[PDB]
Symmetry: C2
Subunit: 158 residues, 2 copies
């Protein structure tokens, strides 16, 4: 619950600061598949989280094959319009499925590890992401990873 | 000053908890030489820090050649009596110079990086370091590294 509070605080903060439509926290599994573990979403949009607090699966073969991809280097990806990005069909279909028109996705490092990703999404319109927003999100994610690691340090020692 | 407060808090905490004679924070330079940047020492012992707040040089060729040595793996070294440890003369002479009879030295990780070391020292007598003290110091150091990284995140972004 203490972790969910941290995810909720960060995700709502992002959504508030960037005035995006949806924020997602995605956590990598050991095999580099991953799970959504938090969503902040404006009420006008169908939420990804169902009433059991389950999420849908995004089975991203590319992240998994590349063991986190660019995010291993602490890089982000900002895409203003998914429909003009030249993506592979299976990837675009998931973007469409999750009502992602434009996204800014940054890595979450927990100590030395690429623990997950933090995504900010625009749902109804493309969005030209500014350099400052990319830099800000990256900082928010670093802060989130520190919060996560701090919580782990306290939760499991004494 | 905000960093010195963190070093002072941690170092005094260690010295208090382990009832050792001296605690040192050592920070690695880019070339894996290093500098002492804080000491907590019981009043009975000559301090390493002079009145200018300068420290003496410990020019450890082995740490430097091995780019941090065992500490890169997050390992510690606990030595109960330096005089029976089989050390190389140049290393033993520095131990003697700094009035180190027994030491417990752990790595300080700042995010993904081996930033430095945290050392607890007994000055006047050997000391059998217990597994629990090794495990505790390791945790204190992880916490210190998190504090350091958090301070860096806040100091240099906005
Ligand atoms: C095809 C069978 C499947 C597929 C392929 C695929 N993915 C990518 C690139 C990425 N996939 C993602 C994943 C996410 N973005 C997010 O916002 C979230 C939630 C936080 C996830 C899980 C990301 C970020 C990228 C860019 C990665 C990078 O290192 O640059 C590719 C490469 C680009 C392309 O489309 O050609 C491919 C082929 N993804 C699926 O979902 C399919 C089922
Ligand atoms: C010889 C010219 C010089 C030298 C050699 C040397 N050092 C080591 C091993 C270590 N040196 C240290 C350093 C410290 N211990 C501390 O508590 C602090 C302050 C925080 C420092 C800087 C450490 C921890 C080790 C163990 C490292 C590891 O990876 O295990 C060796 C190897 C062991 C040996 O003595 O044979 C050698 C040869 N050190 C000097 O100071 C000389 C000038």
């Amino acid at each position: 619950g203490s972790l969910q509070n941290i995810f909720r605080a960060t995700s709502d903060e992002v959504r508030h600061l960037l005035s995006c439509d949806r924020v997602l926290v995605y956590r990598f599994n050991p095999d580099w598949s991953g799970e959504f573990i938090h969503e902040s979403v404006a009420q006008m949009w169908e939420p990804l989280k169902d009433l059991q607090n389950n999420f849908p699966l995004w089975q991203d073969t590319y992240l998994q094959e590349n063991e986190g991809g660019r995010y291993r280097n602490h890089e982000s990806l900002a895409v203003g319009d998914v429909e003009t990005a030249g993506f592979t069909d299976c990837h675009l279909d998931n973007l469409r499925r999750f009502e992602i028109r434009a996204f800014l996705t940054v890595p979450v490092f927990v100590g030395e590890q690429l623990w997950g990703l933090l995504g900010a999404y625009q749902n109804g319109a493309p969005r030209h992401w500014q350099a400052r927003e990319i830099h800000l999100l990256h900082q928010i994610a670093n802060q989130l990873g520190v919060a996560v690691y701090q919580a782990q340090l306290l939760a499991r020692f004494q």
